[PDB]
Every structure is written in C-alpha cells, then in structure tokens.
C-alpha cells in the first residue's frame, strides 16, 4: 500500500501503421524494431527499480497498445474504461477491459461514441485532491462529469489548443509535493488562469518549447524521481533545485508515434482520500434554435461558436419540417467547463436567436447600481439586435438598443421600463440585468531596412537612457492587438520611456490582455465577444483610476501597470469612438492637447508605435531637432510624419509588434 | 430537367458539410430537397442525409455532381454504376465531356469494381487501361493522352476518398481620368499617323470586364500587335464561349470557386 | 497657436524681417469597377426610396471626400434632400471651406489628383477667418463662404456635428472639443436613421457604428479595406462596403440618382 | 544580347569613346514559424523530402544567407526556381550586390550582366563553383551538397544562365519529377513557380506559402487549412525567424 504498481505493454507488434496525430505524420513504418525494444526495455527496467510493473499481453494489429496510459483511468478499485476517438485504437479496448476485469477492478463504461482516453487525458493531483481532465482533441468535455461521479472525485477541466499536444499528459504533469511541470502554450487563457489559481507560482515549473517538443512533460514521477525522454540543462536545474532526481532514458522511437515515458505507463495504485468526493464544474443547458438551419448554415455557426469559445455540445434532436420550404428546428445540449465560459457561450447564442425550452425559461437576474456610472458585477452586455427580457414572468422590449451597454430595469407610471444604457449613464438605485437568464433577441519595408532601423533606434534609445535624456512614446491599440504589449511594458520597466501618450483603447486592451489574457475577446494564445472588454472598463471605473486598479491588486502587469509602478507620466486623449471612457481619459481635447504639449517639452526622441492620429497630433506640436521614429503598416501616417527630412525623422512600414520584438532583442545584444 | 438522389455521411451539422453541399447545388443553377436526416446519437457519431438534387440540364447536373463528388457525396449502393469510357482519337486531346480530376484521392468503378486512380493531380483526365498486372487508372494531363486510350467521361462511377478530417473543414479617379485623357489623345494621334501600337495584356483584363473594350480597340485600328501569355487567351475565349472566367464572376466583380470544367473544356476544344 | 493669442499682442504679418537658422546639414537634404458600380446601383435605389418615403439619412464624412473631388457631389446630395444630418471632424470642414474659398486643399492638388507639399498658409488663413467670424454659419451669412458641403448644410438647415480630435488645428469654433457632449450630439442625430452613409471617415464611422442599432442600412466607403472590413460585420443584408475612391463612388451615385428620377 | 554574340566579333570594353544623345500579426507569423520549424526538423530527422520554391525577392530582401543555411544543414531536398534568383544569389555572393544594390544598406546593371556572362563562359553554375569563382550562397550550397535544382525559364530572363530550362514543356516535366514524394513544399515568394507547383501537387502534401503579394498566398491556401498554411510577410524576415527557431530546437 506504499507499493506502487504500473501497467505497461511490450512493443512486440509496435510500429507506426497509420496517422492519427501530428507526430505520426511522415513516420509510417519508420520505426526501428530493435531500437524500440531497447528503448522500451530501458524504461521498463528503470521503472522496475522503483516500482512494480505488470504487463498486458501484446496484440498483432493494435500497435498502440504499448501506450497503456490510455487504457483507462484507475482510482482505488474503480476504473473508467477508455473509449477511443479513432477506430485504429478502438480495437485495443477489449484487451484493456480484459486486463482490468482479470485484476478485479470495477469497470465503468461510457456511452458509445463519447470519447475519453484514460490517464493520458486525465491526470490526478499527486496528493489525490482532484483530477485534472483534458479536452479539445481526444476526450470529450461531456465525459468529465462521468469521471467525477464514477471515480468520486473533484474534476477540473483544461482545454488543449495545440494539436501536437493532443493529450493532457503531453503538456501537463502533476508532481510530488504540489509541484506542476507543464507547458502553458498548450492551453487556452481560461485554462492557464485555472492552473494559476490552483498552483502557487513557486510550485509551477513552466517549460520552454524546446523542452516541450521533446516530451519533457510526459514524465513518470515515482517519488522524488522523475523519468523522461530528455531534459535541457535548464530544466534539470529547476527540477533538481526543488529536490527531484532526474533520470533520462531515450524514447525517440515512441515519440515517432506521439508518446513517451508517461504514455507507456499506467499507474494503477493511486492515492485515495476519504474526504475526497465527486465534484463537477462542467455545466450544461439545453437550447432550441429554429429556422432554415441546413440552408442558412445557422446551426453550423452556432456549434462552431460553442466550440471556439471553449465549450461542447450534443445535438439532442433535429427535425426537418415536412414541406420543402418549411423551417427546421434543433434542440442542442450546450456544455461548458465553468459558469464563466457558459455565460460567454450563452451570450453569443442569444444573438443567433437561441431560446430556452419553456420548462427552463426563467426571469432575468437583477442587481442594483450603487455608484453612478458603474454597473454591478456580471452585468449582461447588450448587442445591436432587438432584445426582450423576462421580468416577473413577462417578456418586455428593451428600448434604445445599442451594443456595449447595460440593460437597466426601472419602474414607471405605466409599468416596467427596460432600457439599454451606456455604463457612464447608469444611476445609483437602478436595477441592472446580470448573468444570462431571461434574455432573448428577435432576429512594406525589406528585411535589410527594418533591421537597419532597429539597429539605429536601439543604439539611440540606449544612448539617450544612459545620458538621462527624455524619450516620449505614443502608442495605439494595434501594439496590444498585434502582440507587442509585453515588449512595450519591458521598455517602460527598464527605463527607456519617460512619458506615454495614447488614447482610451490602448489602456483598455492592455489591462484586458493582462487581467484575462484577451484583447477584444481574442485569446493571445492564438472575432470574439465584448464581455471581457466591458468588464475591464467597468472595473476600472468602479475603482476610479488605473492607479487604484494597480493599488487594489487587480492590475498586476502590463503597459499601464509599469507606468504606474515606475511613475512614468501618461496621458490618455479621448476620441469620438471611446468606450466608457476610463476615468483617466481626458475628454476635454483642449486640455488633452495642452497636456500632450507639456509632456513633449525637452523630448529628444519620439517613438510613435502605430498611434495614427495621436502621431499626427504629436508631430504638429514638435519642433525640428527632435528625433522622430514612426512605425506603422498604414504606410501613410509614416510618409506624412517622415516629411521633416531624413536626418531627424525615420520611418518603417512594418508590424509594430515585430518591430518592438526586434528592438528589445537588439537592446539585449548591446547588453 | 434532371434529378438524382445523393447520400452524404459524416458530422453533418457541425462541420457545415451539408450546408456547403446545398450552397454549391443552388449557386451552380440547381435545386434540392432534403429527403431525410439521420442524427448521430453523440457529438462524435456520424449523421447521414439523403438529398434529391435537380438540375435544368445534363450539363449543369454534371457540374453539380463534380462539386459534390469532392465533398464525398455517393450513390445509394443500388444506384452505383460503372464510369463511362470514351477513346482518345487524337494525340493530346481528350474525348468530349471528359471528367476533370481534382487534387483529392479518387476511385473509379470499372466493370463493377472500384479502382484507385494513380498519379493524382488537378486538371487532368483519368485514363483507364487493362495491363498484365490488372486494371490501371491514371491521372494524365491532356497533352500526354495517346490515341487509343480510354478516358472517363460524364460523372458516373467516381468517388473521392478524402479522410474524415479532410472533407470537414492607389491612383485617384481624377488622376486616372487625366492620364486616360493624355493616352487617348496620344493614341488617336499615332493611329491617324499610321504608327504602331503594341499591347501586352494579362487575364485581369478579362476579369475586370476590360475584354469588350480591348476587343473594340483592336477592331477599330488602335492595336497592331498583341503580346501575352497562355492565360489571357484561355480566359478571353472562356468568357466569350461560356460566359465564365476561371476564378472570377465577371458580371458581379467578385471571386468565385470552382469553374475548372469550363476552363479545361476550352483548352481541350 | 491661434486660440492662445490675446487682444493687444503684436503679431508678425507679411514676410519681411524673418529668417530661418537651420544648420547646414539640415537645409541640404480592392473593389473592382463592376462591383462598385453594382453596389452604387443598390445604394442609389435604397437612397431614393428612403427620401421619397421621408426617412432619415445620415452621412459621416472625412477630408478624403474633398481631396478626391467628391465635395461637389456630396454638396449636391445635401442640396437635393438626401442628407438629413452630417457628422464629421474639424478637418473635413476646414478642407471643404478651403477648397471652396481658395481652390486648394492642404496636402492635395484636387484638380490633378496628386499629393502636394506646402499649402499651410491657405489652411491656417481659413481657420483664422472662421474663428474671426465666430462660426461657419456667420461665414456663410457674411458671404465669404459661398459654396461647398458646409455651405449647403447652412443654407438648407441640415444639422451637423464636428467632433474634435487630438490632432485638430484651431479648432473651428463649431468643433465640439468636449467629447462626452460630442458623443451625445452624435447619438441624438442618429435617432431615427434608416441609412448611414460612411464616406471614408475612419474613427467617426466606428463611433457611429458603435452607437447604431440593427435595422439601419450601413454603407461604408473607404480606400482602406481595413476599416471597410470592420464596419461590414452586420451581415450583407444590413451592411455594404466597397474599397474604392470615395469621389469615384460619389460621382457614380449622383449619376445613378439622375437616371432614377428622370 | 550576350547570347547572340558570335566568335570573331569585336566588342566594346571599358568606358572610353561612348556617348549618348539625350499583413499577418506578430502572433500569426510567430505561430506559423513555430509550426513550420518543428515540421522541418521533424521531416529532416525522419529522412523525408522537402521541396523549396524560391523567387528573387528572397535574395533582394536579404534572405539568401538564411536559405543557403537551410540547404547546407540538410532541410531542403530540391530547389525549384527561375533564372533571376540564381543570378542575384551569385551576384550577392561574388560582389555583395543584387541589382547593383549594396546589401550593406536603384543602381547599375553591370554587376548583374557580368555574373551572367561569367557563368555562361564557364558553361554552368557547377563549373563556376568548381573553378572557384562561386564560393558561397544558395546555388553554391546546392552544388556542394548535391541538392537537385531546376531553373525554369521565363519571358523576362536575362541571358539566360546555361542551367536555365527554356523549353517549358521540359521544365514542367522536371518540376513534376522533383515533386514526387515531397512531404512539404516551402514556397518562398516565388509567384508563378508557386502556382505552377500547386497545380502539380496532389492533396496530402503540406504546403507553406510565404509572400507579401497577399494573393499567391490566398490562391494557394485554398486547399484547406489542415495541409496548406499561408503567411503574408517579408520572406527574409520569415526565413530569419525560421532559422532562429530551428536553432532553439537545437
């Protein structure tokens, strides 16, 4: 009971016979039988030095039977048998079932065509506190509640987003003493947030891509021992630094099929805790969608949105309608890994006209406005489409519909009024709809050039910083969108920027990217909703300033963060398109022009990072003798600002994120 | 008017496969009726639909079926028939109505038997021959066809074998106008003086509807020589013979997919 | 800058007694025509239908309208009852007034359809002159503005709103530099709109877009396919976008409107 | 023109006695580079086949040293291109220019024509390598590592080089033959050679299409996303990020 047992399976009939993951591609019948046996023996014999190893009898025509991690998932006397997505591994299931039965396990089986691929996609916390379950490529989200019930454990769902890392055990490895070895880039932003909420920074060992493509997460952790294919020096240092002994043993013949040390093993003695019981965060809701579904492609668009947003589905029924022109209807069970993700999904499906089944219809939830111009937490975000809300069992029409507002419910002489209002117009005492119930709708430069300018600009930046001179940066939202924010905030942190001029939008998107890993609802990990965006605006308005957001601890990193922490002055000039705005945004443009002008005094260099109108405005204010550096793909903010002569104005037409990336790289070369 | 029932299987609702099939049918000039839909029990279960396709003529029906074949549309197993074969009679020329190959793995039915096509590439014909090692089906480009070879025509007895994941996915107007004014004047001056004007032209001339105007220029004596490539000649001839131009809907000024059949037909003719 | 001058201050006029002291090194250095035409045909028809039915059409417009020679055509639209409100910035008003008073437009030779350098004097003169009269409307009343977009708005009593920006020169006294009030004024004139015509006005078009519910026909014209692609996310039954010269667009539109009511 | 000169004619040399009478984001590029580098290393290691097509813009933009490195380190099994990329590559390596442009930062055609004439006098690119006048670059590494290349002619070719196939029926055949068995085709802004290669290639071949001309890209990324990847970006920058990424994988 302090004795650890693994199940393995020798490579007697192993080869790459087909392609069902990206590693197998190109590798059919390219496995060396001798090297495969010798590598498998290396792992097997290392494991026997530290644990018990049982073997499954190998079987002709089922080569991936060697990957026993996928046989199923054992906890105590129970096993959930794997159901494989691909037919090429489905033939393994009877032989795995046979072994589990022969060894006295109580075998649970999922519904046919509900994929789940065992310990390879679901990894126990090494203290047995919860089960981490993957979805996205092989196991279905809807298998997770079954795992929770049958194995009687809390299950946390993680969404995989990189096809090379198609099982959770390829990119995620709980270790002894609460440590976690994993590759963040394999997960979406939601999942990364969950990992970080559950595992303290000191306990997280995030690996680099070079280690990840060697299957360094595909590790067998016995006690203080970790066994794997190969580890970089950096990774070895990290692991030994917290007390693991690292054992390497080559498994490249098995990497040819997309597996390594952990895939080749199934731990069948797992820690069972008395106090641990079933807990499910997956939730689901049945919707109905109606119209010309096949013809309009509407059902296809709804399902794709559900999946792209992080959820899952099961079409429960689909009815054609019995005349050639008549509408169709589908009832769809929608699933989500959390309430947060469900709300994002249901919000999108509402626009498409999805509605509740009568039996499930509920009134809209309401919360009070307590501060003028601030909505209550989790307010629903309106769209452009005509909308009705259910109050006291009655559906009423929303007035003054407009996207990106809140819906306020008030009482009047002639009954209830539902009104779409922008955040700043909300008044203390109004009731605002929150959650998502009771809402429906009714229908150019070369490589040489860039590199030369980067070289020159980096040299000048380091030179000016070192002499204690003044650099002003102007920046537009494209810096954040394109992926350049971390580079900018680094410039600001390391002393290269003495003032930042911009608008409302760059501050909102930067704070958004840092709080939720999105920008306009786009996961930086690879369209999307406005909910994250409006939540940011509302949160900063409720605190009252960006700096109070930093002080309260809700802004922990990014461009605006570093400006606050290093006391770099910034000015946000308003525009006609501003959402909110943030409290910090100067909506009196006479004043904004004055504040710009004042911060421009004494500037030796102005770095304009695709800031468009702010760039023009700053050029107009700036005398000759100031070095101007203008970066933009819009090849004529560039030519309109590079008109002051070449000796003092330099222009590049290129992606500003790429430019910033090359710039910070070059600054490092100068040391 | 012709009618044909086809069957489509897979993850029909969420891949939008069914929806792409219906779009092609109507866009190409046909109509449809979904006769039935069998819904898979789970998200990963396969679904199946039977669809009656109608076309106003055989020609349009062939165009539709060619598109549907790539999506994996098949015949009900009792409606399966052998591909029709016609002989090549002139070296490097396919028989009329030859089927146009795609990039996708393809099987053809010869005397009751489905045969894999070798050397697959788009815009070829499929030649069938009996060899000492059995039936051979070969994708060949037109100029490599030899007199005597049997070539698939029409659209019977052909299916794709795409795997599941595959089938399931500056000058302003004022400027231009002043330039045109200067060029028009230089151009009339040169023609009246009997000089020589040479035109080079690419397919975008046809696509933008410039073809009628270039035609007019040549007709009225402004063009003494024309230099271009293969493509402008094929597109010009296609637009004038068939009212189409590979890749562009001239009439609506937008890109379109498909159209290889009309293009290859013109080249072969 | 002009707005900071105080009564009593002495200001240099003419060009005597001024020299530069630059150091030596310093002084020594997508939519095809067929597409656009079918879109115009659809917009012209929707536009006449809406005007005859007494509906409301709102136009947003940027300086590129003037530069491409679209100004005369937009003027004509306003004159003949197709435009119930005009939303824009400081710049379109200054360029329109400059083109009509001086026959020039900062940065562009309208007549020859190419960029030019210089021209700041004519531009600043116009701004200073309107500030002197105190409003665009008084500039029309005094007879110094006699034609053009802003002229037709004043003469036909079409309301307009000029929202300020961080780049504004002057500004004109009409330009709303309080952007909370500007958004409110935009939103007010947008009420009841059946169509919004967005004539390469970038930031104003997005702001208008944010403010506008479904059921409003959106027509978006810009030479930059990036703003067109943004504003066209409402489905092809609500939005239409063409990537083209807006003066070209306006020229055809007025030609096409003539074919309809004759 | 050079190819029309006949033995015994006198030609003017020197310069005396002559006068005249009046789009993709940062995230996107980086993601594709990451994926393509991984696949390239994977294919090389398994002994598979990668075909590269490349146009002169690879040399012009500053990407030649990156390409020749790919070829030297075993990632490229055949190179398909035209006359111009070979001329500019040899030019950059012999005289440090490309169309008379110093790579160190318009310009004359003298360097360009001197290259063409010199290779014609030797009789082939390989004899230029053997005689020691070509000492480095893309064509050099193809010769030294015995990587097959095919230069298809075009209507605009200068010279041409002896190696250039001016019979396009033959050129199409030679392309087709070198494409057999290819697991990946990397198309480095080669325009018409890219289209031509796409037309010849069956499904199942990974296609990677790099170009700023954002519609050789969309016309080749029409075979579905699972097997064709497109980026609109400077090909030199792309190649620079790619070789950097390959080094990170070690």
CATH number at residue C100: 3.40.50.10690
Nearest to D48 among A26, A210, A524 (CB): A26
- For residue A163, the chain D residue with the least C-alpha distance is D35
Length of chain A: 671
Structural contact between residues D29 and D231, judged by C-beta atoms closer than 8 angstroms: yes
Give a yes or no: residue D15 inside a domain. no
CA distance C24 to chain A (A): 12
Is D117 annotated among the ligand-binding residues?
no
Structural contact between residues D216 and D194, judged by C-beta atoms closer than 8 angstroms: yes
CA distance A308 to chain C (A): 18
Give a yes or no: residue C101 inside a domain. yes
Residue C89 near chain B (CB below 8 Å): no
Length of chain D: 250
CA distance A344 to chain B (A): 19
Residue A665: which residues within 8 A CB-CB, separation 6 or more? Answer: none
Consecutive H or E run containing A631? strand A627-631
Q: Report the relative pairing of strands A431-434 and A365-368 from DSSP bridges.
A: antiparallel
Options A9, A171, A173, A263, the catalytic residue = A263
**Residue A472 maps to which CATH number?**
3.40.50.10690
Task: Give the integer Cα–Cα distance in Å for A64 and A13.
Answer: 9
Q: In the 3-class helix/strand/coil scheme, how is A359-412 assigned residue by residue? A: CCCCCCEEEECCCCCCCCCCECCCCCCCEEEEECCEEEEEECCCCCCEEEEEEE
Among A440, A428, A436, which residue's Cα sits nearest to residue A376?
A: A428
Residue A636 near chain C (CB below 8 Å): no
Q: How was this structure determined?
A: X-ray
Give a yes or no: residue C211 inside a domain. yes
Give a yes or no: residue D104 inside a domain. yes
Return the residue in B10, B13, B54 with the most chain A beta carbons within 10 A, the one to mutate for interface testing: B13
Q: D199 vs B122: CB contact, 8 Å cut-off?
A: yes
Task: Give the integer Cα–Cα distance in Å for C244 and C248.
Answer: 7
Taking the CB of residue A595, how many other CB atoms lie within 10 A of it?
18
Q: Which chains touch D (3 or more CB pairs under 8 A)?
A: A, B
Chain B positions in Cβ-Cβ contact with residue C34 (cut-off 8 Å): 208-209, 250-253
Residue A69: which residues within 8 A CB-CB, separation 6 or more? Answer: A118, A119, A120, A167, A169, A259, A262, A263, A264, A265, A266
Chain B positions in Cβ-Cβ contact with residue A295 (cut-off 8 Å): 19, 22
Structural contact between residues A61 and A52, judged by C-beta atoms closer than 8 angstroms: no
Give a yes or no: residue D20 inside a domain. no
Q: Report the relative pairing of strands B47-55 and A279-280 from DSSP bridges.
A: unpaired
Structural contact between residues A651 and A639, judged by C-beta atoms closer than 8 angstroms: yes
Among B269, B246, B238, which residue's Cα sits nearest to residue B95?
A: B269
Structure tokens at B244: 């189409």
Taking the CB of residue A420, how many other CB atoms lie within 10 A of it?
21
Structure tokens at D75: 């990632």
Give a yes or no: residue A478 inside a domain. yes
Nearest to B22 among A85, A294, A299 (CB): A294
Options A9, A144, A167, A599, the catalytic residue = A167
Q: Which chains touch C (3 or more CB pairs under 8 A)?
A: A, B
Nearest to A589 among C166, C169, C211 (CB): C166
Structural contact between residues C29 and C54, judged by C-beta atoms closer than 8 angstroms: no
Q: 3-state DSSP call for residue D68?
A: helix
Where is the domain boundary, A255, A271, A287?
A271
Binding residue positions of C for NAD(+):
90-91, 169, 201-204, 222, 245-246
Give a yes or no: residue C52 inside a domain. yes
Query: The domain containing residue C99 runs over which residues?
Result: 31-260
Query: The domain containing residue A577 runs over which residues?
Result: 446-670
Structural contact between residues A628 and A495, judged by C-beta atoms closer than 8 angstroms: no
Q: In the 3-class helix/strand/coil scheme, how is chain B assigned residue by residue? A: CEEEEEEEEECHHHHCHHHHHHHHHHHHCCEEEEEEEECCCCCCCCEEEEEEEEECCHHHHHHHHHHHHHCCCECCCCCCCCCEEEECCCCCCCCCCECCCCCCCEEEEECCEEEEEECCCCCCEEEEEEECCEEEEEEECHHHCCCCCEEEECCCCEEECCCHHHHCCCCCHHHHHHHHHHHHHHHHHHHHCCCCCEEEECCHHHHCCCHHHHHHHHHCCCCCEEEECHHHHHHHHHHHHHCCECCEECCCCEECCCCHHHHHHHHHC
The reply to whether omega before A189 is within 30° of 0 (cis) is no
- Please count the residue pairs, one from chain B and one from chain C, whose beta carbons lie less than 8 angstroms apart: 51
Chain B positions in Cβ-Cβ contact with residue A304 (cut-off 8 Å): 14, 16
CA distance B12 to chain A (A): 9
Q: Report the relative pairing of strands C239-243 and C217-222 from DSSP bridges.
A: parallel
The A residues from 444 to 463 touching D (CB cutoff 8 Å) are 444-448, 450-452
Structure tokens at D178: 């070198």
Task: Give the integer Cα–Cα distance in Å for A142 and A149.
Answer: 12
The reply to whether omega before B6 is within 30° of 0 (cis) is no
Return the residue in C245, C250, C254, C255 with the most chain B beta carbons within 10 A, the one to mutate for interface testing: C245
Q: 3-state DSSP call for residue A7?
A: strand
Residue A1 near chain B (CB below 8 Å): no
First-to-final CA distance of chain C: 51
Structure tokens at C255: 């030609």
**Residue A40 maps to which CATH number?**
3.75.10.10
Nearest to C34 among B176, B178, B209 (CB): B209
Give a yes or no: residue C117 inside a domain. yes
Count of alpha carbons within 13 angstroms of residue C129, beta-carbon side: 19
Resolution (A): 2.1
Nearest to B175 among C31, C37, C113 (CB): C113
Structure tokens at B223: 């063009």
Task: Give the integer Cα–Cα distance in Å for D84 and C178.
Answer: 59
> What is the tally of structural domains in chain D?
1
Among A159, A57, A158, A152, which residue's Cα sits nearest to residue A108?
A: A152
- For residue D225, the chain B residue with the least C-alpha distance is B169
Q: B103 vs D223: CB contact, 8 Å cut-off?
A: yes
- For residue B250, the chain C residue with the least C-alpha distance is C34
Instruction: Write the CA distances from D106 to A234, B198, D160, D213, integer angstroms.
Output: 48, 28, 22, 21
Is A630 among the residues known to form the active site?
no
Return the residue in D199, D202, D206 with the most chain B beta carbons within 10 A, the one to mutate for interface testing: D202
Helices (H) and strands (E) in chain A, counts: 22, 36
Taking the CB of residue A24, how many other CB atoms lie within 10 A of it?
18
Angle at which helices D64-72 and D83-95 cross, to 10°: 100
Is A167 among the residues known to form the active site?
yes
Give a yes or no: residue C204 inside a domain. yes
Structural contact between residues B25 and B77, judged by C-beta atoms closer than 8 angstroms: no
> What is the tally of structural domains in chain C?
1
Give a yes or no: residue C126 inside a domain. yes
Among D36, D13, D37, D33, which residue's Cα sits nearest to residue D25?
A: D33
Give a yes or no: residue D48 inside a domain. yes
Nearest to D203 among B105, B123, B143 (CB): B105
Residue D103 near chain A (CB below 8 Å): yes
Q: In what order do the strands lie in the sheet with A78-81?
A: A72-75, A78-81, A106-108
């Amino acid at each position: 009971t302090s004795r650890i047992r693994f199940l393995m399976c020798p490579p007697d009939h192993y080869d790459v016979d087909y392609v069902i993951n990206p590693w197998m591609e190109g590798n059919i019948h390219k496995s060396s039988r001798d090297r495969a046996v010798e590598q498998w023996q290396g792992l097997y014999q290392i494991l026997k030095e530290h644990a018990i190893v049982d073997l499954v009898t190998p079987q002709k025509g089922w080569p991936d039977l060697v990957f026993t991690a996928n046989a199923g998932l054992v906890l105590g006397d129970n096993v959930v048998l794997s159901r494989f997505l691909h037919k090429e591994r489905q033939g393994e299931e009877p032989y795995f079932k046979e072994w589990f039965e022969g060894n006295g396990y109580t075998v649970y089986e999922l519904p046919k065509d509900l994929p789940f691929e065992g310990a390879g996609d679901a990894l126990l916390d090494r203290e047995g506190r919860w089960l981490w379950a993957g979805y996205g490529f092989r196991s279905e989200l809807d298998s997770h509640p079954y795992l929770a019930k049958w194995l009687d454990i809390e299950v946390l769902s993680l969404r995989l987003i990189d096809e090379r890392f198609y099982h959770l055990d390829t990119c995620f490895c709980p270790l002894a003493n609460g440590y976690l070895l994993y590759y963040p880039g394999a997960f979406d932003s939601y999942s990364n947030r969950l990992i970080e909420m559950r595992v303290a920074p000191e306990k997280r060992i995030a690996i680099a891509e070079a280690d990840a493509v060697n299957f360094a997460c595909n590790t067998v952790n016995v006690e203080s021992i970790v066994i794997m294919n190969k580890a970089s020096d950096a990774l070895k240092q990290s692991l030994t630094g917290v007390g693991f002994q690292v054992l390497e043993t080559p498994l490249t013949e098995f990497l040819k099929a997309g597996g390594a040390a952990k895939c080749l093993t199934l731990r069948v003695t797992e820690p069972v805790r008395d106090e641990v019981h079933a807990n499910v965060y997956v939730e689901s809701r049945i919707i109905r969608i109606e119209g010309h579904l096949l013809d309009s492609g509407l059902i296809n668009r709804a399902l794709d949105m559900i999946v792209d947003t992080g959820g899952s589905f099961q079409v429960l029924n689909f009815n054609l309608g019995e005349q050639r022109q008549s509408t169709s209807a589908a009832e769809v069970k929608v699933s989500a890994p959390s309430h947060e993700v469900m709300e994002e999904i249901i919000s999108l499906l509402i626009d498409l006209g999805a509605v509740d089944l009568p039996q499930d219809e509920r009134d809209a939830k309401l919360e009070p406005v307590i501060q003028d111009g601030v909505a209550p937490d989790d307010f629903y975000v309106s769209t452009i489409y005509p909308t009705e809300v259910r109050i006291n069992g009655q559906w009423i029409k929303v007035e003054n519909q407009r996207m990106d507002g809140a819906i306020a419910i008030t009482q009047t002489p002639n009954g209830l009024l539902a009104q779409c209002k922008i955040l700043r117009d909300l008044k203390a005492g109004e009731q605002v709809i929150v959650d998502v119930l009771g809402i429906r709708t009714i229908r150019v430069s070369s490589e040489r050039r860039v590199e030369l300018v980067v070289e020159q600009v980096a040299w000048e930046l380091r030179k000016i910083r070192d002499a204690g001179g003044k650099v002003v940066v102007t920046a537009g939202p494209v810096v954040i969108h394109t992926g350049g924010g971390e580079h900018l905030s680094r410039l600001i942190r390391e002393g290269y920027v003495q003032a930042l001029l911009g608008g409302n939008a760059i501050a909102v998107h930067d704070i958004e990217q840092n709080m939720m890993g999105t920008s306009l609802g786009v996961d930086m990990k690879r369209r999307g909703g406005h909910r994250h965006h409006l939540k940011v605006i509302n949160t900063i308005r409720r605190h009252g300033s960006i700096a109070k957001g930093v002080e309260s601890g809700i802004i922990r990193s990014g461009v605006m963060y570093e400006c606050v922490r290093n006391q770099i002055p910034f000015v946000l000039a308003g525009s006609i398109r501003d959402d909110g705005p943030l409290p910090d945004t100067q909506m009196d443009l006479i004043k904004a022009q004055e504040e710009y002008a004042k911060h421009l005094e004494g500037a030796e260099m102005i770095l304009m990072l695709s800031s468009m109108l702010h760039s023009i405005g700053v050029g107009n204010m700036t005398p000759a003798g100031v070095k101007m550096v203008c970066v933009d793909i819009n090849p004529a903010v560039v030519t309109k600002l590079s008109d002051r002569g070449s000796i003092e104005s330099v222009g590049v037409v290129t992606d500003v994120g790429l430019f910033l990336s090359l710039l910070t790289q070059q600054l490092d070369k100068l040391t | 008017v012709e009618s044909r029932i086809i069957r489509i299987e897979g993850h029909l609702l969420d891949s939008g496969l069914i929806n792409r099939a219906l779009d092609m049918i109507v866009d190409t000039g046909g109509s449809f009726q979904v006769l039935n839909f069998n819904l898979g029990e789970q998200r990963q279960s396969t679904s199946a639909a039977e669809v009656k396709v109608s076309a106003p003529s055989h020609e349009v029906m062939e165009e539709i079926i060619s598109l549907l074949i790539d999506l994996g549309a098949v015949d009900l197993p009792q409606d399966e028939r052998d591909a029709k074969l016609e002989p090549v009679i002139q070296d490097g020329v396919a028989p009329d109505d030859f089927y146009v190959s795609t990039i996708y793995p393809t099987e053809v039915r010869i005397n009751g038997q489905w045969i894999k096509v070798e050397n697959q590439r788009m815009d070829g014909a499929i030649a069938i021959t009996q060899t000492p090692n059995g039936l051979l089906a070969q994708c060949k480009i037109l100029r490599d066809l030899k007199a005597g070879e049997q070539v698939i025509v029409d659209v019977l007895g052909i299916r794709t074998i795409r795997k599941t994941e595959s089938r399931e996915q500056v000058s302003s107007e004022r400027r231009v106008e002043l330039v045109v004014e200067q060029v028009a004047w230089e151009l009339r001056k040169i023609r009246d003086a009997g000089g020589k004007v040479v035109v080079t032209a690419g397919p975008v001339v046809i696509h933008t509807g410039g073809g009628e105007h270039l035609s007019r220029l040549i007709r009225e004596g402004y063009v003494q020589a024309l230099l271009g490539g293969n493509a402008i000649a094929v597109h010009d001839i296609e637009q004038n013979m068939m009212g189409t131009s590979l890749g562009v809907d001239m009439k609506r000024g937008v890109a379109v997919r498909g159209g290889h059949r009309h293009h290859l037909k013109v080249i072969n003719t | 800058i002009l707005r900071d001058l105080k009564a009593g201050e002495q200001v240099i006029v003419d060009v005597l007694g001024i020299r530069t002291i630059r150091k030596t090194e310093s002084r020594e250095q997508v939519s095809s025509e067929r597409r656009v035409e079918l879109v115009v045909e659809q917009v012209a028809w929707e536009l006449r239908k809406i005007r005859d039915a007494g509906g409301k059409v709102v136009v947003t417009a940027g300086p590129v309208v003037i530069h491409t020679g679209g100004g005369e055509h937009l003027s004509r639209l306003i004159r003949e009852g197709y435009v119930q409100a005009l939303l824009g910035g400081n710049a379109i008003a200054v360029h329109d007034i400059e083109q009509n008073m001086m026959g020039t437009s900062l940065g562009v030779d309208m007549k020859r359809g190419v960029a030019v350098r210089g021209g700041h004097r004519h531009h600043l003169k116009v701004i200073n002159t309107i500030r002197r009269h105190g409003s665009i409307a008084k500039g029309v009343e005094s007879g110094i503005i006699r034609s053009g977009v802003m002229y037709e708005c004043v003469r036909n009593q079409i309301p307009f709103v000029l929202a300020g920006s961080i780049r504004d020169d002057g500004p004109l006294p009409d330009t709303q530099m309080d952007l909370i009030k500007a958004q409110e004024e935009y939103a007010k004139h947008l009420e009841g709109a059946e169509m919004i015509l967005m004539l390469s006005s970038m930031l104003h078009s997005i702001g208008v877009g944010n403010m506008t519910p479904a059921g409003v026909k959106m027509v978006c014209v810009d030479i930059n396919p990036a703003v067109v692609t943004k504003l066209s996310d409402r489905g092809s039954i609500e939005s239409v976008g063409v990537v083209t010269d807006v003066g070209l667009f306006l020229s055809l539109l007025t030609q096409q409107l003539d074919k309809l009511t004759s």
